[PDB]
Amino acid sequence: FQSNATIELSIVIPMYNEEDNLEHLFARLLEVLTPLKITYEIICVNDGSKDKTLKQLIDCYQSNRQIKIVNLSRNFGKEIALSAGIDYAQGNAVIPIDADLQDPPELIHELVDKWREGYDIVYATRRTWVKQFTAKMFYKVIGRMTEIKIPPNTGDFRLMDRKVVNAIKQLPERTRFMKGLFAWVGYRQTFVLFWNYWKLWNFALDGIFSFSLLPLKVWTYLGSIISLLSLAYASFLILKDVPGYASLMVAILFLGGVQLISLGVIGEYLGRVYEEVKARPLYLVSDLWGLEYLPL
Amino acid sequence: FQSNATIELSIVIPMYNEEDNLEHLFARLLEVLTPLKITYEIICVNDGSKDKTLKQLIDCYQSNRQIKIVNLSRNFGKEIALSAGIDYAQGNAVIPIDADLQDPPELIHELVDKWREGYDIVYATRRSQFTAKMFYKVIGRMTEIKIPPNTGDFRLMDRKVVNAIKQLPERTRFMKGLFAWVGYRQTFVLFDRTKWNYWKLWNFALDGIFSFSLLPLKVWTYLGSIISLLSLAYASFLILVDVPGYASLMVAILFLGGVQLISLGVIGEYLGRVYEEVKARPLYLVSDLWGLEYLPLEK
Amino acid sequence: FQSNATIELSIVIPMYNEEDNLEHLFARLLEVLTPLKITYEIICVNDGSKDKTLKQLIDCYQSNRQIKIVNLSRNFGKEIALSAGIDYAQGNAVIPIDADLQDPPELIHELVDKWREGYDIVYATRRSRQGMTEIKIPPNTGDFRLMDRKVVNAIKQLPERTRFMKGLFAWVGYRQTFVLFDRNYWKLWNFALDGIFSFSLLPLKVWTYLGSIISLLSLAYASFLILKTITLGDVPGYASLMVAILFLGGVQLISLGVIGEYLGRVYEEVKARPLYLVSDLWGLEYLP
Amino acid sequence: FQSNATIELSIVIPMYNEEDNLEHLFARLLEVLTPLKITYEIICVNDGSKDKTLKQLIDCYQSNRQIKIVNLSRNFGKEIALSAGIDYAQGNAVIPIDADLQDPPELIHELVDKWREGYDIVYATRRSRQGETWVKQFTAKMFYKVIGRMTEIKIPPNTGDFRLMDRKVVNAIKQLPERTRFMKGLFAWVGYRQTFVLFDRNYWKLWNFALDGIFSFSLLPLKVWTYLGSIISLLSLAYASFLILKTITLVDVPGYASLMVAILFLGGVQLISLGVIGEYLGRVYEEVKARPLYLVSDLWGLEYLPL
Ligand SMILES: O=c1ccn([C@@H]2O[C@H](COP(=O)(O)OP(=O)(O)O)[C@@H](O)[C@H]2O)c(=O)[nH]1
Ligand SMILES: O=c1ccn([C@@H]2O[C@H](COP(=O)(O)OP(=O)(O)O)[C@@H](O)[C@H]2O)c(=O)[nH]1
Ligand SMILES: O=c1ccn([C@@H]2O[C@H](COP(=O)(O)OP(=O)(O)O)[C@@H](O)[C@H]2O)c(=O)[nH]1
Ligand SMILES: O=c1ccn([C@@H]2O[C@H](COP(=O)(O)OP(=O)(O)O)[C@@H](O)[C@H]2O)c(=O)[nH]1
Ligand SMILES: [Mg+2]
Ligand SMILES: [Mg+2]
Ligand SMILES: [Mg+2]
Ligand SMILES: [Mg+2]
């Protein structure tokens, strides 16, 4: 009869219009977390639902000490409402879970076991020439574990140690932790076994611009050397071949073309500077049930 | 009788050259606030008045425990002088009121009524075509707050809303779009008795798409880049089809020279917004305070 | 008889190679501050002097309780060394003066009298001759002024406190007055242009609208006014090509000038390096 | 004997795949620090090593109270792993040393001697008299005008990575992201009391850092080009307004000789304006980014920051 006051595991569940599944969600999770003999909590983030999902949450909160509600002021999205629950999650390990149980909750028993071996981040991965080209370009930077990338694998069902949650707590990229932040932070990582390449390589471009200044730096010197090769081609060649229209239009279309993507890479990084300096917060909490406001 | 050390309501009245209306304003407010039987405070923000308005404020301060003065260092904006009073206003609900008193102060009896029901932001809009059908689907579900014949400047905000926007520079222009972003429980009450111009309302729709979004900068970067690869590839292909001479040489140099100027506009616009976000300069400066304490110098 | 804990007045002196003036500066200052019957402190900021200025300062520090030394790591300039002196200066009023006494210390008695009346900022501007406030063109108000504690705290975190006379004095407001005493026009509007960029943003928005509307008058003229009149099969080509490339190619450079001007100000606001570095302190405490 | 609570010296060593050198490193260092009779600590930064370097550090940690370990989450640069150790190093003086022992550790006796004399920064530049040429005299004269008499700590065949720093200096640059490249210009900007100690035991990267210095510690590359770019804009604007106001004629002057050059000159100066603007924009992103400089996975013999 020892009353333990420390929380070991946190289950963060972003929910938007999940009124029917609330009965099957909390019940199936209970038969998985009970045999673990580990103190836990369930953080339920209300993402501005209309179908009275909040009223049904307060009923589960009223008869379950492990149910805690984070009511958002409006609909902010899955990635943002999930970050809201992790901020209010004060456990040693954090496991985000979808409400429709697309992944089996029994994998929590497999996530916590590999977590107690020393690994700080534990993933859960399911199982033409584009499949051989994409898988080869990424192993040169991602590292040992790239199976979380190849479709239809998404690392949205994972376990993270408290050290990883606090590290990326102040980073605006914590909303899209799978967009590349997982590979930058490193730590001890592993996974357990159990699409659309147009959007897969859209993250490849979004990752090069976010974690690197190469697109801006490379085109700065590339756009500078062709400016020196420019001004020199009319410096010594003005004291006096002249194809006329065969190069008056070409130079107008070339020198004017290289500037448009120079303004493109500048406007891209400028928009990223605004996102980093803006004072507008990521989300707003309307009400809280079973939790305290932040900062504590 | 017992005492109470918690303020429940805070009204904020920015004042510039309001030497005349002080006697009628406080008398009118007292006959409205006293029947509520609720603890309140009155924040009067002297915004660099020149007609001895402050000298009359201090006299009202001396004889009324509810009067609290925030004297600014110089004359700032009416929106700025309003944010100063909200920063120094304690209490669970904040409602700013004007000094000319175009809207009846008795309307606060119903802003507080909808606030007790659970609504966090309660507007007071006056009663009186394609644009209204536009904003109802993209901007806000309650377009009646920012209608031409009435602006939502007479409103009541809960403490949770005041604290959430305390650090945002957009709190100066809360009606310029920030109200549609914060969410929360919103509702309005309807009443009857420059602005109101349609060019000034779409200026609010233009100032909003740039403040709360990156689309004007993102859609133009991708657009200016795809026309750039068309410009450099068609130039290489033209340097090895039809060569219309002046019918293309004048058009091309004048098209690229014009698309770069608008590209420089969206960059210079967002650069000015990045600048205003990183300034260490505050919105206002407080010269003197009556019945209040200074804010922590951390800021 | 009895002790006093709070300091009322603070005199801040930036010092660079002032080994000689120290005997005459402290003696003449004591002759003016003593009849005031007001507790005071003297903050001396050593701005990397090459001579024996610091050694003579510590000697005056040993035999005078009102002398306090702020030793900067290297030379940072008169403006930065003066901002450092005010940062370490406690006291309801702050009066900065120079070591070479072009500013007569006897004006301190007149600046403190205007401050007693309620003025928050009292300037000491030299008389002009030659051929409110706004004395910023002939000799003009220098760094000789009085500022209440409320003013120095308001602009403490502001980087513009270094150049307080370049425009920040007109932005802060407060109760201001000046005092006249005796004994280039290019720098006039160089500082007037330095102010219209820091406290306005209008030079950026005015050229954004002007640069965009002439981009509308531009694009529309050749997109389908030239395309609609030449689709049938024109203005003097060379006369129209030269006037187009040099009007459009040049207005972009002014757009690049204002954008590059405001980009540098963003870099100065967000840079993490400090304005100065203190090497040693005498009779003071470190910040924060 | 009695106990002392203040640490006088802090030795920081970044370590990446130094499994073999750990035995000789701690042994040779202990024979240099023991005669000093001052309290010291050794901060070891595990910069994501791949072999068993961390396993051997913990054993040395288990039998030496001066050994302290900072295990980074992954492999960063040498400049980053060294800044991580300085953050966790507590002591009146800080001396960074390499693990492969490229410079003799007996110079610590000379660095501490110059530190107690009042110098806040004490360098240890190698004494090399070879390579004296006209290019070595031009760079020396150009760098002496901004760095000072101390500028001798950066000859081509040596740097200033072996140095002593007082606590006042490591605190002054603690929050500065330029602390990693401290020997890229930041040393000349702080301007504390500096000196060096001599011992005997490329020009591409020298002027590449001199170009990286005028952009980092100045705005001249941006301010000079905006003024130079605006004055040649007035020259192109007025000269064009007069060429179009010259109505005393009507097919071409210098036709393709000047018009092809005009689009060329005005099109090249903009690319240089875009270069300096994009360069400083990337610097603004590096200053405002919330992403940290490193991440600590585990600590041995230390506490997490802030204290
Ligand atoms: O706007 C949204 C949409 C998603 N969700 C939650 O995020 C999870 C995503 O599940 P869904 O099946 O709707 O998306 P998908 O499975 O395709 O990723 C669900 O538990 C939702 O409750 C949310 O909180 N806000
Ligand atoms: O510089 C100013 C201008 C206005 N006001 C206050 O804001 C209100 C503006 O009233 P006005 O009739 O001019 O604006 P409107 O009634 O149309 O909102 C007045 O009550 C003033 O007290 C102010 O504090 N400072
Ligand atoms: O690099 C400098 C130059 C100026 N000063 C101080 O600033 C004051 C102004 O002196 P200066 O004659 O050079 O300026 P001016 O008289 O021309 O205004 C003097 O007391 C100096 O001690 C300084 O601290 N560091
Ligand atoms: O990626 C790296 C490379 C360097 N080092 C450390 O930094 C020092 C540099 O050693 P190296 O000989 O490789 O560099 P150099 O001697 O040429 O300066 C070594 O002690 C390493 O332990 C590190 O921690 N991470
Ligand atoms: Mg699902
Ligand atoms: Mg009015
Ligand atoms: Mg002088
Ligand atoms: Mg080595």
Side-chain angles (χ1 to χ4, degrees), chain D residues 50-51 53-54 56-81:
Chain D
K50 288 301 175 62
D51 55 77
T53 299
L54 180 57
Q56 188 171 347
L57 274 172
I58 300 181
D59 290 340
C60 303
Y61 162 85
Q62 254 293 331
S63 59
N64 195 338
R65 302 304 283 254
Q66 292 81 69
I67 295 298
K68 298 172 179 178
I69 307 177
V70 183
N71 186 28
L72 306 186
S73 64
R74 59 165 184 80
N75 175 268
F76 295 83
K78 176 198 173 184
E79 303 173 346
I80 294 183

mmCIF file of all heavy atoms in Angstrom, chain D residues 50-81, unseen atoms left out:
data_model
loop_
_atom_site.group_PDB
_atom_site.id
_atom_site.type_symbol
_atom_site.label_atom_id
_atom_site.label_comp_id
_atom_site.label_asym_id
_atom_site.label_seq_id
_atom_site.Cartn_x
_atom_site.Cartn_y
_atom_site.Cartn_z
ATOM 1 N N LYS D 50 32.850 5.982 -31.557
ATOM 2 C CA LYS D 50 32.329 4.740 -32.109
ATOM 3 C C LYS D 50 32.897 3.494 -31.446
ATOM 4 O O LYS D 50 32.197 2.479 -31.368
ATOM 5 C CB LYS D 50 32.599 4.672 -33.617
ATOM 6 C CG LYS D 50 31.744 5.625 -34.435
ATOM 7 C CD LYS D 50 30.264 5.340 -34.229
ATOM 8 C CE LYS D 50 29.392 6.365 -34.934
ATOM 9 N NZ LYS D 50 29.600 6.356 -36.407
ATOM 10 N N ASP D 51 34.139 3.540 -30.966
ATOM 11 C CA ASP D 51 34.740 2.378 -30.321
ATOM 12 C C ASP D 51 34.364 2.320 -28.847
ATOM 13 O O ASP D 51 33.266 2.734 -28.460
ATOM 14 C CB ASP D 51 36.262 2.400 -30.480
ATOM 15 C CG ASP D 51 36.884 3.685 -29.969
ATOM 16 O OD1 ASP D 51 37.014 3.838 -28.737
ATOM 17 O OD2 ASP D 51 37.246 4.538 -30.802
ATOM 18 N N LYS D 52 35.272 1.808 -28.014
ATOM 19 C CA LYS D 52 35.052 1.685 -26.579
ATOM 20 C C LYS D 52 35.728 2.804 -25.793
ATOM 21 O O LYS D 52 36.217 2.577 -24.680
ATOM 22 C CB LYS D 52 35.535 0.322 -26.086
ATOM 23 N N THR D 53 35.762 4.018 -26.352
ATOM 24 C CA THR D 53 36.385 5.140 -25.653
ATOM 25 C C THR D 53 35.598 5.515 -24.401
ATOM 26 O O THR D 53 36.191 5.842 -23.365
ATOM 27 C CB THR D 53 36.510 6.340 -26.590
ATOM 28 O OG1 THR D 53 37.333 5.994 -27.712
ATOM 29 C CG2 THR D 53 37.130 7.535 -25.868
ATOM 30 N N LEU D 54 34.267 5.465 -24.475
ATOM 31 C CA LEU D 54 33.449 5.804 -23.313
ATOM 32 C C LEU D 54 33.565 4.753 -22.218
ATOM 33 O O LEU D 54 33.528 5.093 -21.029
ATOM 34 C CB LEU D 54 31.991 5.978 -23.732
ATOM 35 C CG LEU D 54 30.994 6.327 -22.621
ATOM 36 C CD1 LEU D 54 31.416 7.600 -21.901
ATOM 37 C CD2 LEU D 54 29.586 6.462 -23.178
ATOM 38 N N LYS D 55 33.711 3.479 -22.590
ATOM 39 C CA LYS D 55 33.821 2.426 -21.583
ATOM 40 C C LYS D 55 35.087 2.586 -20.750
ATOM 41 O O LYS D 55 35.091 2.293 -19.548
ATOM 42 C CB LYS D 55 33.787 1.052 -22.249
ATOM 43 N N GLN D 56 36.173 3.050 -21.370
ATOM 44 C CA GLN D 56 37.420 3.239 -20.643
ATOM 45 C C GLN D 56 37.409 4.517 -19.811
ATOM 46 O O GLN D 56 38.061 4.574 -18.762
ATOM 47 C CB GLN D 56 38.599 3.247 -21.620
ATOM 48 C CG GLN D 56 39.965 3.257 -20.955
ATOM 49 C CD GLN D 56 41.091 3.051 -21.949
ATOM 50 O OE1 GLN D 56 40.859 2.668 -23.095
ATOM 51 N NE2 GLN D 56 42.318 3.305 -21.511
ATOM 52 N N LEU D 57 36.681 5.545 -20.258
ATOM 53 C CA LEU D 57 36.576 6.774 -19.476
ATOM 54 C C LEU D 57 35.860 6.531 -18.156
ATOM 55 O O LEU D 57 36.239 7.091 -17.121
ATOM 56 C CB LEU D 57 35.852 7.852 -20.281
ATOM 57 C CG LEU D 57 36.685 8.711 -21.233
ATOM 58 C CD1 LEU D 57 35.780 9.594 -22.077
ATOM 59 C CD2 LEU D 57 37.674 9.560 -20.451
ATOM 60 N N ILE D 58 34.816 5.697 -18.171
ATOM 61 C CA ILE D 58 34.060 5.433 -16.954
ATOM 62 C C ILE D 58 34.914 4.696 -15.931
ATOM 63 O O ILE D 58 34.779 4.921 -14.723
ATOM 64 C CB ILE D 58 32.770 4.659 -17.293
ATOM 65 C CG1 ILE D 58 31.895 5.483 -18.239
ATOM 66 C CG2 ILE D 58 31.999 4.310 -16.031
ATOM 67 C CD1 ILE D 58 30.588 4.817 -18.606
ATOM 68 N N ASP D 59 35.816 3.822 -16.387
ATOM 69 C CA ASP D 59 36.729 3.163 -15.460
ATOM 70 C C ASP D 59 37.706 4.158 -14.846
ATOM 71 O O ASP D 59 37.975 4.110 -13.641
ATOM 72 C CB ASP D 59 37.482 2.038 -16.169
ATOM 73 C CG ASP D 59 36.582 0.868 -16.518
ATOM 74 O OD1 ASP D 59 35.507 0.740 -15.895
ATOM 75 O OD2 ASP D 59 36.954 0.075 -17.408
ATOM 76 N N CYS D 60 38.250 5.069 -15.660
ATOM 77 C CA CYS D 60 39.082 6.137 -15.117
ATOM 78 C C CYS D 60 38.270 7.069 -14.226
ATOM 79 O O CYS D 60 38.806 7.633 -13.267
ATOM 80 C CB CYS D 60 39.737 6.924 -16.249
ATOM 81 S SG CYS D 60 40.734 5.923 -17.374
ATOM 82 N N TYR D 61 36.981 7.241 -14.530
ATOM 83 C CA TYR D 61 36.106 8.019 -13.662
ATOM 84 C C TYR D 61 35.896 7.321 -12.324
ATOM 85 O O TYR D 61 35.805 7.978 -11.279
ATOM 86 C CB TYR D 61 34.769 8.265 -14.364
ATOM 87 C CG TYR D 61 33.633 8.672 -13.449
ATOM 88 C CD1 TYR D 61 33.455 9.998 -13.079
ATOM 89 C CD2 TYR D 61 32.733 7.730 -12.970
ATOM 90 C CE1 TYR D 61 32.416 10.372 -12.249
ATOM 91 C CE2 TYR D 61 31.692 8.095 -12.135
ATOM 92 C CZ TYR D 61 31.540 9.418 -11.778
ATOM 93 O OH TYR D 61 30.502 9.787 -10.951
ATOM 94 N N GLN D 62 35.829 5.988 -12.333
ATOM 95 C CA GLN D 62 35.562 5.224 -11.119
ATOM 96 C C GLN D 62 36.746 5.182 -10.164
ATOM 97 O O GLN D 62 36.585 4.708 -9.034
ATOM 98 C CB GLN D 62 35.144 3.796 -11.484
ATOM 99 C CG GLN D 62 33.664 3.518 -11.298
ATOM 100 C CD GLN D 62 33.248 3.543 -9.841
ATOM 101 O OE1 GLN D 62 34.043 3.244 -8.949
ATOM 102 N NE2 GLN D 62 31.996 3.908 -9.589
ATOM 103 N N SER D 63 37.923 5.656 -10.580
ATOM 104 C CA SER D 63 39.108 5.620 -9.728
ATOM 105 C C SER D 63 39.857 6.948 -9.726
ATOM 106 O O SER D 63 41.049 6.976 -9.409
ATOM 107 C CB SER D 63 40.045 4.486 -10.154
ATOM 108 O OG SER D 63 40.456 4.647 -11.500
ATOM 109 N N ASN D 64 39.186 8.045 -10.068
ATOM 110 C CA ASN D 64 39.818 9.361 -10.072
ATOM 111 C C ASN D 64 38.723 10.400 -9.875
ATOM 112 O O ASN D 64 37.872 10.578 -10.752
ATOM 113 C CB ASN D 64 40.583 9.601 -11.372
ATOM 114 C CG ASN D 64 41.546 10.772 -11.276
ATOM 115 O OD1 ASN D 64 41.389 11.657 -10.438
ATOM 116 N ND2 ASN D 64 42.549 10.778 -12.147
ATOM 117 N N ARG D 65 38.746 11.084 -8.727
ATOM 118 C CA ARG D 65 37.715 12.068 -8.425
ATOM 119 C C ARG D 65 37.826 13.313 -9.293
ATOM 120 O O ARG D 65 36.871 14.096 -9.354
ATOM 121 C CB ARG D 65 37.771 12.455 -6.944
ATOM 122 C CG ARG D 65 37.602 11.281 -5.991
ATOM 123 C CD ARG D 65 36.303 10.534 -6.254
ATOM 124 N NE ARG D 65 35.136 11.240 -5.731
ATOM 125 C CZ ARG D 65 34.469 10.873 -4.642
ATOM 126 N NH1 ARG D 65 34.852 9.803 -3.958
ATOM 127 N NH2 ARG D 65 33.418 11.574 -4.234
ATOM 128 N N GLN D 66 38.958 13.513 -9.968
ATOM 129 C CA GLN D 66 39.112 14.668 -10.845
ATOM 130 C C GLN D 66 38.544 14.428 -12.237
ATOM 131 O O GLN D 66 38.291 15.398 -12.962
ATOM 132 C CB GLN D 66 40.589 15.057 -10.955
ATOM 133 C CG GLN D 66 41.197 15.612 -9.671
ATOM 134 C CD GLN D 66 41.604 14.526 -8.695
ATOM 135 O OE1 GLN D 66 42.551 13.777 -8.940
ATOM 136 N NE2 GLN D 66 40.891 14.435 -7.579
ATOM 137 N N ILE D 67 38.335 13.175 -12.622
ATOM 138 C CA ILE D 67 37.815 12.856 -13.949
ATOM 139 C C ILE D 67 36.308 13.065 -13.963
ATOM 140 O O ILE D 67 35.586 12.538 -13.110
ATOM 141 C CB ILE D 67 38.181 11.417 -14.346
ATOM 142 C CG1 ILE D 67 39.696 11.269 -14.492
ATOM 143 C CG2 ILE D 67 37.478 11.024 -15.638
ATOM 144 C CD1 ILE D 67 40.297 12.146 -15.567
ATOM 145 N N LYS D 68 35.830 13.841 -14.934
ATOM 146 C CA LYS D 68 34.408 14.086 -15.121
ATOM 147 C C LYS D 68 34.084 13.979 -16.602
ATOM 148 O O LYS D 68 34.854 14.447 -17.446
ATOM 149 C CB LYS D 68 34.000 15.461 -14.569
ATOM 150 C CG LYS D 68 34.219 15.601 -13.069
ATOM 151 C CD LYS D 68 34.000 17.023 -12.589
ATOM 152 C CE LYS D 68 34.206 17.130 -11.087
ATOM 153 N NZ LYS D 68 34.048 18.525 -10.596
ATOM 154 N N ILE D 69 32.945 13.363 -16.916
ATOM 155 C CA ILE D 69 32.599 12.986 -18.279
ATOM 156 C C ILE D 69 31.350 13.737 -18.719
ATOM 157 O O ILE D 69 30.385 13.862 -17.956
ATOM 158 C CB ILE D 69 32.383 11.461 -18.397
ATOM 159 C CG1 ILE D 69 33.589 10.709 -17.833
ATOM 160 C CG2 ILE D 69 32.139 11.064 -19.846
ATOM 161 C CD1 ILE D 69 33.430 9.204 -17.847
ATOM 162 N N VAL D 70 31.375 14.236 -19.954
ATOM 163 C CA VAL D 70 30.218 14.855 -20.597
ATOM 164 C C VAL D 70 30.000 14.092 -21.899
ATOM 165 O O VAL D 70 30.745 14.276 -22.869
ATOM 166 C CB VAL D 70 30.421 16.352 -20.858
ATOM 167 C CG1 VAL D 70 29.166 16.960 -21.467
ATOM 168 C CG2 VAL D 70 30.799 17.070 -19.577
ATOM 169 N N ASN D 71 28.987 13.233 -21.929
ATOM 170 C CA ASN D 71 28.707 12.404 -23.097
ATOM 171 C C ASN D 71 27.689 13.113 -23.980
ATOM 172 O O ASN D 71 26.538 13.314 -23.576
ATOM 173 C CB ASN D 71 28.200 11.028 -22.672
ATOM 174 C CG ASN D 71 28.021 10.084 -23.844
ATOM 175 O OD1 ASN D 71 28.705 10.201 -24.862
ATOM 176 N ND2 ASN D 71 27.099 9.142 -23.707
ATOM 177 N N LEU D 72 28.107 13.493 -25.183
ATOM 178 C CA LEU D 72 27.208 14.136 -26.128
ATOM 179 C C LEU D 72 26.309 13.099 -26.789
ATOM 180 O O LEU D 72 26.671 11.928 -26.931
ATOM 181 C CB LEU D 72 27.998 14.905 -27.187
ATOM 182 C CG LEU D 72 29.017 15.919 -26.659
ATOM 183 C CD1 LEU D 72 29.626 16.720 -27.799
ATOM 184 C CD2 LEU D 72 28.385 16.844 -25.628
ATOM 185 N N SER D 73 25.117 13.547 -27.197
ATOM 186 C CA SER D 73 24.136 12.634 -27.775
ATOM 187 C C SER D 73 24.641 12.006 -29.068
ATOM 188 O O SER D 73 24.287 10.865 -29.382
ATOM 189 C CB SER D 73 22.821 13.372 -28.027
ATOM 190 O OG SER D 73 22.994 14.400 -28.985
ATOM 191 N N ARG D 74 25.457 12.730 -29.826
ATOM 192 C CA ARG D 74 26.032 12.218 -31.061
ATOM 193 C C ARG D 74 27.348 12.949 -31.307
ATOM 194 O O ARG D 74 27.860 13.651 -30.432
ATOM 195 C CB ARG D 74 25.052 12.378 -32.228
ATOM 196 C CG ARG D 74 24.630 13.813 -32.484
ATOM 197 C CD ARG D 74 23.972 13.955 -33.843
ATOM 198 N NE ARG D 74 23.638 15.342 -34.152
ATOM 199 C CZ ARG D 74 24.510 16.238 -34.605
ATOM 200 N NH1 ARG D 74 25.778 15.897 -34.793
ATOM 201 N NH2 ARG D 74 24.117 17.476 -34.863
ATOM 202 N N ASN D 75 27.894 12.786 -32.508
ATOM 203 C CA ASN D 75 29.161 13.403 -32.868
ATOM 204 C C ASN D 75 28.915 14.788 -33.452
ATOM 205 O O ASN D 75 28.227 14.927 -34.468
ATOM 206 C CB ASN D 75 29.928 12.535 -33.866
ATOM 207 C CG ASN D 75 31.200 13.201 -34.356
ATOM 208 O OD1 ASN D 75 31.202 13.882 -35.381
ATOM 209 N ND2 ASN D 75 32.289 13.012 -33.619
ATOM 210 N N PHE D 76 29.478 15.804 -32.810
ATOM 211 C CA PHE D 76 29.495 17.164 -33.317
ATOM 212 C C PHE D 76 30.909 17.500 -33.779
ATOM 213 O O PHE D 76 31.778 16.628 -33.877
ATOM 214 C CB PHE D 76 29.000 18.139 -32.245
ATOM 215 C CG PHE D 76 27.557 17.950 -31.869
ATOM 216 C CD1 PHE D 76 27.185 16.989 -30.944
ATOM 217 C CD2 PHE D 76 26.571 18.739 -32.438
ATOM 218 C CE1 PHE D 76 25.857 16.814 -30.596
ATOM 219 C CE2 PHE D 76 25.242 18.573 -32.091
ATOM 220 C CZ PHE D 76 24.886 17.608 -31.171
ATOM 221 N N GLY D 77 31.145 18.774 -34.067
ATOM 222 C CA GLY D 77 32.481 19.215 -34.397
ATOM 223 C C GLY D 77 33.370 19.276 -33.170
ATOM 224 O O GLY D 77 32.920 19.197 -32.027
ATOM 225 N N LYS D 78 34.676 19.410 -33.420
ATOM 226 C CA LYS D 78 35.609 19.606 -32.316
ATOM 227 C C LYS D 78 35.332 20.921 -31.601
ATOM 228 O O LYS D 78 35.461 21.012 -30.375
ATOM 229 C CB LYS D 78 37.051 19.566 -32.819
ATOM 230 C CG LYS D 78 38.073 19.862 -31.734
ATOM 231 C CD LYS D 78 39.424 20.242 -32.315
ATOM 232 C CE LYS D 78 40.372 20.699 -31.217
ATOM 233 N NZ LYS D 78 41.674 21.173 -31.759
ATOM 234 N N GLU D 79 34.945 21.952 -32.355
ATOM 235 C CA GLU D 79 34.630 23.242 -31.751
ATOM 236 C C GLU D 79 33.402 23.160 -30.854
ATOM 237 O O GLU D 79 33.334 23.853 -29.834
ATOM 238 C CB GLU D 79 34.422 24.290 -32.845
ATOM 239 C CG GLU D 79 35.605 24.452 -33.786
ATOM 240 C CD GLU D 79 35.304 25.381 -34.946
ATOM 241 O OE1 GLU D 79 34.116 25.686 -35.174
ATOM 242 O OE2 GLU D 79 36.260 25.808 -35.630
ATOM 243 N N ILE D 80 32.428 22.324 -31.213
ATOM 244 C CA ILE D 80 31.210 22.204 -30.417
ATOM 245 C C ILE D 80 31.465 21.381 -29.161
ATOM 246 O O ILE D 80 31.069 21.769 -28.055
ATOM 247 C CB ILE D 80 30.075 21.603 -31.264
ATOM 248 C CG1 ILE D 80 29.672 22.567 -32.382
ATOM 249 C CG2 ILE D 80 28.878 21.267 -30.389
ATOM 250 C CD1 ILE D 80 28.517 22.074 -33.226
ATOM 251 N N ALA D 81 32.128 20.231 -29.312
ATOM 252 C CA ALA D 81 32.419 19.386 -28.157
ATOM 253 C C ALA D 81 33.315 20.099 -27.152
ATOM 254 O O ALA D 81 33.240 19.827 -25.951
ATOM 255 C CB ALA D 81 33.063 18.077 -28.612
#
